[PDB]
Every structure is written in structure tokens, then in C-alpha cells.
Amino acid sequence: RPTFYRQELNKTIWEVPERYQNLSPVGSGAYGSVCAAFDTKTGHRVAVKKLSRPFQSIIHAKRTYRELRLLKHMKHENVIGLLDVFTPARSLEEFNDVYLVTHLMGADLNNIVKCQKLTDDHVQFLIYQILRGLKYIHSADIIHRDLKPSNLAVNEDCELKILDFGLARHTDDEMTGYVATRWYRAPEIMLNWMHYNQTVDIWSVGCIMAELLTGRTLFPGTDHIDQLKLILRLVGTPGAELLKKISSESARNYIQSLAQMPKMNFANVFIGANPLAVDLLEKMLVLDSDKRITAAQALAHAYFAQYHDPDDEPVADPYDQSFESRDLLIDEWKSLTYDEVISFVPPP
Ligand SMILES: Clc1ncnc2ccsc12
Ligand SMILES: [Cl-]
Ligand SMILES: [Cl-]
Ligand SMILES: [Cl-]
Numbered sequence: 001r002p003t004f005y006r007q008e009l010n011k012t013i014w015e016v017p018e019r020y021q022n023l024s025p026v027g028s029g030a031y032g033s034v035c036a037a038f039d040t041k042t043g044h045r046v047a048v049k050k051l052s053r054p055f056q057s058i059i060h061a062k063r064t065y066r067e068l069r070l071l072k073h074m075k076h077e078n079v080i081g082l083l084d085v086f087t088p089a090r091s092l093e094e095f096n097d098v099y100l101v102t103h104l105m106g107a108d109l110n111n112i113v114k115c116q117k118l119t120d121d122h123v124q125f126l127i128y129q130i131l132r133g134l135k136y137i138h139s140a141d142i143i144h145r146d147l148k149p150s151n152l153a154v155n156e157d158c159e160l161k162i163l164d165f166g167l168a169r170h171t172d173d174e175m176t177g178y179v180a181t182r183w184y185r186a187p188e189i190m191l192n193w194m195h196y197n198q199t200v201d202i203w204s205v206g207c208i209m210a211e212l213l214t215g216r217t218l219f220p221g222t223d224h225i226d227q228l229k230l231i232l233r234l235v236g237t238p239g240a241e242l243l244k245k246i247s248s249e250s251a252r253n254y255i256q257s258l259a260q261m262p263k264m265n266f267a268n269v270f271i272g273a274n275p276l277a278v279d280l281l282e283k284m285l286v287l288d289s290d291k292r293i294t295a296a297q298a299l300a301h302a303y304f305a306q307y308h309d310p311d312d313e314p315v316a317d318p319y320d321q322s323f324e325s326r327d328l329l330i331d332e333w334k335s336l337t338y339d340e341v342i343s344f345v346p347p348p
């Protein structure tokens with residue numbers, strides 16, 4: 001067991017191993033209560049997250065367990081990983097607090113899209129890295145569900161990592177009105193059309209790729225219905241085949257109230273873009289999720305010929321998510337979480 005020391009960080013008591021020094025608050029609270037520190041064992045600048053009220057309800061205890069399981073699994077160059085997890089508790093009986101340690105992220109994609117001039121070469125390398133990380137995530141039967149520029153960390157060398165695993169499901173209020181939290185969402189999940197699957201993430205990558213090419217949000221809707229109208233004007237209204245797959249009768253009735261529209265010519269929308277970029281966007285932004293390109297298929301597209309290496313695009317170890325359908329008490333979720341804290345092995 002390391003030695004711990006205590007300090008008050010803006011009306012919060014932090015108790016952490018001596019290896020972590022020079023703690024100071026960071027971020028806009030998007031990933032929880034997070035400080036920056038220097039890790040003296042590894043020489044890296046790190047983010048230390050202290051969870052708020054991790055065991056206060058069954059819902060919160062299960063969310064804590066879910067976040068720790070997901071972060072312990074993810075071992076890939078293009079995905080956030082866990083550097084450490086600790087508790088000052090010396091037994092299950094005194095366990096209350098959980099702390100997670102990751103690499104400190106400086107800038108996200110929004111900063112570079114907003115403030116930098118990007119070459120077709122920059123767009124190739126950024127989207128190649130997102131798809132490489134997604135091929136890995138999807139091989140474990142994990143759906144990200146929230147890919148957007150603020151969840152993509154980017155460094156000076158244009159190297160990228162994917163963020164946001166096992167945090168609270170987004171509320172209907174967070175999704176209301178003129179908000180970036182909805183602009184990257186696939187239509188079948190935005191409007192609850194049907195049981196969704198991993199194909200939702202490829203819609204999101206299409207929306208991100210279009211914005212890197214134009215410097216503008218692709219579907220900046222003022223509300224759910226305005227955003228659906230922007231989507232159908234580009235990709236066309238649904239045919240009988242997709243309408244059959246909308247399980248919700250009222251959602252089917254609403255769609256049929258709209259005048260039919262054809263798919264637009266993407267070369268006249270993305271004026272001057274690399275024809276290979278236009279071709280890939282047409283294969284991602286397909287209304288029927290069964291027909292969209294997969295991450296593994298997209299890596300082999302000619303747009304990525306300069307970066308694609310099929311011997312260096314790895315898949316994940318198997319991920320057991322059977323706990324997700326399990327009904328347990330608060331103390332049972334707390335015991336499962338304690339075992340995952342004490343069994344952690346740090347990366348090489
Ligand atoms: Cl990205 C992400 N998802 C869930 N928890 C954390 C803690 C630090 S970064 C992070
Ligand atoms: Cl230490
Ligand atoms: Cl990492
Ligand atoms: Cl504790």
C-alpha cells in the first residue's frame with residue numbers, strides 16, 4: 001500500500017498516493033471532479049478524477065461499476081486508457097471513495113476545427129484514427145453513442161484519442177434545442193425509431209468528417225424536428241423498406257406526413273472536396289443503419305491508402321457485459337467495484 005496525503009481542493013478533501021504531486025483543478029466538469037497532477041512514477045502529466053457519491057443509489061453504484069469495467073478494458077493507441085485506480089480505504093468496510101487516473105488531455109477537436117486551416121491530408125489522418133479506435137471498440141460489442149468533437153482529444157502531432165465511457169445516460173433536457181449534444185446523433189436514436197446498434201457511431205463519424213471538410217456543423221438543428229428536416233433534405237426521405245423497420249407506429253405516421261424528397265448530389269454540397277472523401281461520406285450518411293459502411297470496411301476505403309496497414313489495426317479482447325442485465329443491491333455493486341479496484345494491474 002502506498003503512503004497517502006490529504007489536501008482540500010476547493011471545499012473537497014482529496015487523499016492520494018505521494019506519487020501524485022502539484023494537484024490543481026482542470027476542465028469544465030464534463031467528465032466529473034478532475035484535477036491535473038504530475039505522476040512522479042511515470043513522468044506523465046495526468047488527470048485525477050474523484051467520483052461524487054459513487055454508491056448513493058442502486059443506479060449510481062451500477063454506473064460506478066460500469067465506468068471502472070469499461071476503462072479497465074480499453075487498451076488501444078486511439079482510445080482513453082486507465083493509468084491507475086485507487087482508494088484510501090484499507091478494507092471493504094471503510095470503502096467510500098474511488099479515484100481514476102488518465103493521461104491529461106490538453107485540446108479537443110473543436111479547438112483545431114474552429115481555429116486551424118486543415119489540408120485533405122489532416123482530414124485523412126484524423127478520421128483514419130477515429131475509425132481505427134472504433135474498429136477496436138466495436139470488436140468488443142461496445143457502442144460509444146456520444147461521438148462528437150468535444151469527446152476527441154488531439155495533440156500537437158495530430159494524434160487522436162476517443163473519450164466518454166460509462167458516464168450517466170444523457171437526459172432529454174441536455175438534448176433539447178440548439179445544442180451540440182444532439183447534432184451528431186443518428187436519426188434512429190434521436191427519435192427512438194427502433195432498437196439501435198453499433199451503426200449509430202458511423203453516422204456520427206460522417207457528421208464529424210463533413211465539419212472538418214467545410215468548417216461548419218452538418219446538421220445544426222434548432223430542435224429534434226428541425227434537425228430531422230435538415231437530415232432528410234440531404235439523404236432523402238425513407239422508402240418502404242426502411243419504414244417497415246420503424247417499430248414505433250406514431251414515428252412511422254409522422255414520417256409519412258412529409259413530402260417525398262430525393263437524396264442530394266454530395267459533390268454539389270461538399271464543393272471542391274477530394275472525390276474519395278465525397279464517396280466515403282455517401283457510404284457513412286445512409287438513413288437505413290443496416291446499409292451503412294462498418295469501421296473495418298471504411299479502413300480499407302481508398303481515401304485512407306496512405307495510412308491503412310491491415311497488420312496494425314488491432315481488435316479487442318472479449319468483453320463480458322452480462323452484469324448489465326443483472327439485478328443487485330447497493331452493497332453487492334459496491335463489493336464488485338472494490339474487487340476491481342484491488343485487482344488493477346498498471347500498464348507496462
Ligand atoms: Cl473519457 C472518460 N470516460 C469516463 N471516465 C473518465 C475519467 C477520466 S476521462 C474519462
Ligand atoms: Cl506513492
Ligand atoms: Cl491513454
Ligand atoms: Cl474511501
Ligand SMILES: [Cl-]
Nearest residue numbers: 148149150180
Ligand atoms: Cl462537440
Ligand SMILES: [Cl-]
Nearest residue numbers: 318319320321
Ligand atoms: Cl471481460
Ligand SMILES: [Mg+2]
Nearest residue numbers: 146164167170
Ligand atoms: Mg456523453
